Design a protein around this nucleic acid. Structure first.
Ligand SMILES: [Zn+2]
Ligand SMILES: [Zn+2]
Lengths: 128, 522, 539, 50, 49
DNA sequence: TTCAACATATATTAGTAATACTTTTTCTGCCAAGTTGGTTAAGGCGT
DNA sequence: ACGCCTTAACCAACTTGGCCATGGAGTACAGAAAAAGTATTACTAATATATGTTGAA
């Protein structure tokens, strides 16, 4: 690409369609509104896009040229590492149900500190 | 500071006698202390330019063989000069040259500006003006004032010859001093009278040398000198004195600089006069300078030389100017009528030939005036007195610079009595500052008086109202020769043609870089 | 400066810093030093104590010691001296107060057997049962029920009766039980080298492995001895149902607590990657298998002897099939009607097993429904970290470290190639990550001997260090938090004396909720941090 | 201070000093190497001596 | 910096180490007050001691 | 030769307005002893 | 039986503070750009030296 930004933009753009790639749309309205046993047997679903993204990239609405499926995979690799998606059998991919982030407990989001006054906190470097 | 615990004596006496080296007061006998405990044996844009600044500073400094200590003066000055941002805007050699010059001058040493500067390519008037600026930017006083009494030595050292020169030097100094006494000194380069008395007393000691040799250390011209040589030959009791006995004449006669003698060449109460009034007028539309420059009697268009249209008019003998944005400066205006009225005439070519561009914002940027008292006055002391509010340097400029804060005007001074008061935007301020400093003028005299009324003539605003203030009054003041100041289309197709044959490279580079714009894209 | 953080109270004390306050938070008093000094210097003798502690010799020495014994806070060894008589040297139990350090969480271990009576006096019953147990630690239904009233149906006052056995609960302390493991292995290393019928003096391997075999297989029934013993389980007196053996005292069973909380983690992590339907399925499935899986227990033998770079695998292989096959008999093949809240056809609904895929489970008897097990738990452990640093420090540290996972000892260009944002950030997140552990460093000499800026700077995972630094975490609040709990005692200590015996003043009324709900914040805040600590201390 | 000139003081070197030890004089050391040498009182703390 | 290689950047382990370095000659070797120094000259009629 | 005379510069205040020019300011590439390794000898260890 | 590798003792390499005491004067790399400030570039418009030259006597 280029060495400067707005990859994160086109990233979070493709992440959307990637969320579509797995089960139906978000259905995050109430707690369990998922595929409901993943339609019929998610075992039957072996799915990903790879090249398809480019046919998907046809939308443009942005200043750029197209990009190679190789570097497409590179774009995939960050959200692998950022854990927004999953890498299965090479070109097949999944979503990490990240969306629950986007929206006892062990999730970092959906957690807020008191973090004023009281000395009872847990900082990280309370000992360095 | 310390006081005894008992006698409470305020004075302590140290005993080094027996080599106890103790401290005790004559009031008690109870010591202050035992065995006084003694001792033995980064990167910043500023700080780095202080490294380099010391490098330059010291190096070029003792290239003159000046004392090392003195250099640190300027080093502070230079550092002090960093504070007011006086340093950045211009060359470095200007800077260091300046701050060293303010040291040596302030410290009264023997070195010369025209000389010191001559270490470079420099016109020497440049760095002179640099030094002149920090007079504004830093804030100084009468401190830098010298005389040949110093510089004859450094000159005398440079000519070798014999030691009688010293005897000659004593002969020369008082000689020049009487010449300083007879009032021919000030207003001229001290080196001139220096080499003068050199040739005089060396002539008194009859050693045959050349004016080339004299000016060689003096760094002036020869005819420059001999003007002062025979300018002595005519002086009071000159040939009466010029013989032996080492000029024991201490007397004076009169003191009459040739300055006002050239005032005799055409031969308060004397009123300063208007010369020019600097102003400005806004049009209100930006336009093409060449398009208006096409048909005119007086104009010039060469943005290569300077970007503007040169405009002037023979009536009422006024110049002014025009700008590109629809602004102008009014110049050559001796009074407000001739100023504002002609200032309206410029809009008459415009609305006649060019665009509309009405007459707006007529405002005085400056007013000029001049006067003379017809007698000598002592600036040396006047400066020594008012050098707070005054500025003078002997060779930097013959006249003296005065600065009045109330009101704010620069005063141009001459021992001829000729005084130029300028730098004011108001008429009355002329005679306000003038008659204000007149008690200093008549205060310093050697061996009219009625200002009448402080304000006599009508004000500036009177003559301003005597001319139409409405921009749309134009054809009324049209001289009808401005109808004729336009020219035919042929003289535009010929004059303008010549302009194009000349400027096709200038415009060619304009449009060519305008093509580089397209190249810039790619 | 000015003590407000007090690095003294904190920075310079690894590990035992927890312990010596725990016992302090428990006892302190006379009892404080002995554990502190012990864990500090290690092996210690009775006579050897008072030459250091100045601990009220041979009384609080004896007193605190038997105190720890009753509560099994020490590891305990005696043998004859080399001349004769007998000598006793001492160690500290496991993590010891580790038992106490859960407590309320061990109280939560009841919530598995909270079932079969929900929200009953039976709840309060088994409650006082357990904490009375854990305060002393070794009791009998003869001793307990003896103290308890004898006018409340025996098979009910003490309602948990057959339920005394289960998985967790209690096992009689015997010999080896609190005896130091590392040596008692060596104690079993006798009788094999020690019994050699002067066979052949060659190849100690034949001597070693065989002894090892013995040492192995003997040790098995050793630790399998507490695993189950029938004389407890079996007893059914006349006109009665099966009971435990009321005779010998039994003690808290820590294993199924480990496996239980580790389960709870898996409920969370798996719950993260799957849906609450499939999740709760996995949850109720694990309720059966957490019975059989050691899951923290396997080390044991690994602890206490040098491995061998091959023979290390000769231990690993045993963990490969162990639970997978023979306990596989105890494991999922066909399970029936676990709970249901779903309804109607339960079969392919139960085939939701196959919905399990990654990065765990999803291995079965090629046409029966089964989850891999003794292979599962191990490579499960390796994964467990995951999330551990994000709002820990920064979002971006994730993807790089995660990337630092897949690649290895690369460098910043190939990072910035793979990675994104800007070197301005890349350094920060990395540098702020290198400030502790994680990346470590790699570098190689470049056209020089070794020099400062010439060479290249490389990055590596080393979860050995990583998984072994989260104890620094232990050193944070589990270190501190306990103090500001204790330190706040002396605040109200005067009132604490009065206020406890009362059931007065406005500020009293105020500071009630202050210090108390404050204690909610500390204690709950602790258990919070604990659920995280439940891993890197063991697996 | 050092030597002659500035001001006085004289040199007990080690090799010079130890000659007194052959006479084993306790106090002569103290008065000599202490009371007349550097007269000072340190203040310390039994607990954690510093 | 400099960088004409000023030799004695060393201040410390030195000041404690040899010769005039304290812990021998400036501590065990203290230069002691109340003394005096002069040249000699014989006096036989002065008693021994 | 001496005049002489004539032109240039020159210090102020305005300007625009524009271009052009330097800076500053970041902001960056001599003996005894440990010390090693290099050698060998034994010694299991499997053939 | 015979060979192999593993462990360990030896020996030769590179290695480092010592080195009279007392006096007694004596003693940070080079290159860029962004900012900013000023010079020039016309005008009055008044100086009196200073200089240049030339030139007429
Ligand atoms: Zn006193
Ligand atoms: Zn202390």
């Amino acid at each position: 690409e280029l060495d400067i930004e707005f990859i994160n933009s086109l990233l979070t753009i493709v992440w959307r369609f990637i969320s579509e790639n797995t089960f139906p749309n978000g259905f995050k309205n109430f707690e369990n509104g998922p595929k409901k046993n993943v339609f019929y047997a998610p075992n039957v679903k072996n799915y990903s896009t790879t090249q398809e993204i480019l046919e998907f990239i046809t939308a443009a609405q942005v200043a750029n040229v197209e990009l190679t499926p190789s570097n497409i995979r590179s774009l995939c690799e960050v959200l692998v590492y950022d854990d927004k998606l999953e890498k299965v059998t090479h070109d097949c991919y999944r979503v990490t149900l990240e969306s629950i982030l986007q929206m006892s407990i062990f999730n970092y989001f959906k957690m807020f500190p008191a973090s004023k006054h009281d000395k009872e906190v847990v900082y990280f470097d309370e000992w360095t | 500071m310390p006081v005894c615990k008992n006698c409470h004596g305020t004075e302590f006496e140290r005993d080094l006698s027996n080599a106890n080296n103790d401290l005790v007061c004559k009031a008690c006998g109870v010591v202050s202390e035992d065995n006084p405990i003694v001792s033995e044996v980064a990167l910043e844009s500023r700080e780095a330019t202080l490294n380099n600044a010391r490098r330059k500073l010291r190096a070029v400094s003792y290239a003159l063989h000046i004392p090392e200590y003195i250099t640190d003066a300027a080093f502070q000055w230079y550092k002090l000069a960093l504070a007011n941002n006086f340093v950045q805007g211009r060359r470095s050699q200007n800077v260091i040259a300046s701050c060293l010059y303010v040291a040596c001058r302030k410290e009264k040493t023997h070195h010369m500006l025209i000389d010191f500067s001559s270490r470079l390519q420099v016109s020497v008037y440049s760095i002179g003006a640099t030094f002149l600026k920090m007079v504004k930017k830093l804030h100084i006083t009468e401190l830098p004032l010298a005389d040949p009494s110093l510089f004859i030595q450094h000159f005398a050292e440079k000519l070798d010859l014999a030691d009688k020169k010293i005897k000659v030097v004593k002969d020369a100094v008082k000689l020049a001093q009487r010449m300083s006494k007879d009032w021919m000194f000030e207003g001229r380069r001290p080196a001139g009278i220096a080499g003068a008395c050199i040739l005089l007393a060396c002539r008194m000691n009859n050693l045959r040398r050349t004016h080339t040799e004299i000016v060689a250390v003096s760094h002036v011209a020869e005819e420059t000198l001999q003007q002062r040589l025979n300018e002595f030959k005519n002086t009071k009791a000159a040939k009466l004195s010029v013989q032996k006995f080492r000029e024991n004449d201490v007397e004076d006669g009169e003191a009459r600089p040739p300055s006002f003698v050239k005032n005799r060449k055409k031969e308060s109460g004397i009123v300063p006069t208007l010369q020019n009034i600097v102003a400005t007028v806004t049009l209100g539309c930006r336009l093409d300078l060449k398009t208006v420059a096409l048909h005119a009697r007086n104009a010039e268009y060469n943005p290569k030389r300077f970007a503007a249209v040169i405009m002037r008019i023979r009536e009422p003998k006024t110049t002014a100017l025009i700008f590109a944005s629809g602004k102008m400066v009014v110049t050559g205006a001796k009074s407000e009528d001739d100023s504002k009225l002609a200032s309206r005439k410029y809009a008459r070519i415009i609305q006649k030939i060019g665009f509309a561009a009405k007459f707006t914002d007529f405002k005085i940027q400056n007013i000029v005036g001049s006067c003379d008292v017809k007698f000598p006055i002592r600036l040396e002391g006047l400066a020594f007195s008012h050098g707070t509010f005054s500025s003078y340097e002997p060779e930097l400029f013959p006249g003296l610079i005065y600065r009045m804060v109330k009101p704010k005007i620069v005063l141009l001074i001459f021992v001829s009595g000729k005084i130029v008061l300028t730098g004011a935007k108001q008429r009355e301020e002329i005679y306000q500052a003038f008659e204000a400093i007149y008690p200093v003028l008549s205060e310093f005299r050697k061996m009219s008086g009625s200002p009448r009324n402080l304000h006599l003539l009508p004000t500036t605003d009177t003559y301003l109202s005597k001319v139409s203030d409405d921009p749309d009054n134009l054809e009324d003041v049209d001289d009808e020769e401005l109808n004729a100041h336009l020219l035919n289309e042929e003289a535009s197709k010929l004059k303008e043609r010549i302009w194009i044959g000349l400027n096709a490279d200038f415009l060619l580079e304009q449009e060519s870089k305008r093509l580089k714009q397209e190249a810039d894209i790619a | 400066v000015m003590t407000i953080s007090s690095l003294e109270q904190r920075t310079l004390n690894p590990d035992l810093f927890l312990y010596k306050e725990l016992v302090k938070a428990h006892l302190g008093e006379r009892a404080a030093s002995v554990i502190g000094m012990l864990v500090a210097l290690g092996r210690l003798s009775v006579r050897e104590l008072v030459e250091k502690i100045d601990g009220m010799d041979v009384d609080s020495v004896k007193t605190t010691l038997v105190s720890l014994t009753q509560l099994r806070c020490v590891k305990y060894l005696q043998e004859t001296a080399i001349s004769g008589k007998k000598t006793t040297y001492y160690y500290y139990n496991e993590e010891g107060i580790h038992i106490l350090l859960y407590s309320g969480l061990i109280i939560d271990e009841i919530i598995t057997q909270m079932r079969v009576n929900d929200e009953e006096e039976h709840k309060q019953l088994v409650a006082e049962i357990v904490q009375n147990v854990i305060s002393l630690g070794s009791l009998t239904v003869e001793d307990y029920l003896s103290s308890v009233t004898s006018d409340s149906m025996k098979y009910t006052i003490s309602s948990l009766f057959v339920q005394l056995c289960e998985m967790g609960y209690l096992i009689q302390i015997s010999k080896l039980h609190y005896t130091p493991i590392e040596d008692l292995w060596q104690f079993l290393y006798e009788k094999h080298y020690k019994n050699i019928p002067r066979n052949s003096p060659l190849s100690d391997l034949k001597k070693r492995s065989q002894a090892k075999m013995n040492a192995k297989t003997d040790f098995a029934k050793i630790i399998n001895k507490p695993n189950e013993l029938s004389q407890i389980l079996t007893v059914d007196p006349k006109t009665s149902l099966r009971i435990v053996k009321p005779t010998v005292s039994l003690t808290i069973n820590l294993d199924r607590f480990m496996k239980g909380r580790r389960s709870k983690q898996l409920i969370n992590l798996a719950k993260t990657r799957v849906g609450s339907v499939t999740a709760q399925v996995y949850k109720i499935a694990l309720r059966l298998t957490e019975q059989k899986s050691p899951k923290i227990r396997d080390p044991l033998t690994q602890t206490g002897l040098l491995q061998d770079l091959e023979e290390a695998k000769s231990f690993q292989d045993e963990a490969e099939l162990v639970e997978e096959k023979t306990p596989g008999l105890t494991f999922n093949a066909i399970d029936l009607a676990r709970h249901l809240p779903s309804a109607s056809l339960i079969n392919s609904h139960l085939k939701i097993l196959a919905s399990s895929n990654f990065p765990f489970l999803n291995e079965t008897k090629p046409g029966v429904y089964y989850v891999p097990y003794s292979k599962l738990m191990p490579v499960l452990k390796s994964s467990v970290y995951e999330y551990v640093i994000a709002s820990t420090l920064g979002p971006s540290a994730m993807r790089l470290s995660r990337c630092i996972r897949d690649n290895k000892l690369v460098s910043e260009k190939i990072i910035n190639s793979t990675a994104l944002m800007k070197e301005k950030d890349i350094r920060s997140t990395l540098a702020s990550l290198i400030r502790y552990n994680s990346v470590e460093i790699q570098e190689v000499p470049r056209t020089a001997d070794r020099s400062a800026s010439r060479a290249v700077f490389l990055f590596r995972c080393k979860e050995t260090h990583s998984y072994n630094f989260m104890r620094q975490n232990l050193e944070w609040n589990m270190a501190n938090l306990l103090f500001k709990k204790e330190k706040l005692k002396q605040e109200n200590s005067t009132l604490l004396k009065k206020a406890n015996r009362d059931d007065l003043l406005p500020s009293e009324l105020n500071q009630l909720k202050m210090v108390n709900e404050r204690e909610l914040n500390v204690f709950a805040r602790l258990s919070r941090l604990l659920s995280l600590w439940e891993v890197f201390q063991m697996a | 201070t050092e030597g002659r000139s500035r001001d006085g003081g004289l040199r007990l070197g080690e090799m010079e000093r130890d000659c007194v030890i052959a006479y084993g004089a306790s106090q002569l050391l103290l008065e000599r190497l202490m009371i007349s040498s550097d007269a000072f009182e340190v203040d310390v703390c039994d607990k954690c001596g510093l | 910096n400099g960088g004409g290689k000023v030799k004695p950047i060393r201040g410390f382990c030195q000041r404690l180490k040899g010769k005039q370095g304290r812990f021998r000659g400036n501590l065990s070797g203290k230069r002691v007050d109340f003394s005096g120094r002069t040249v000699i000259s014989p006096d036989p009629n002065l008693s021994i001691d």
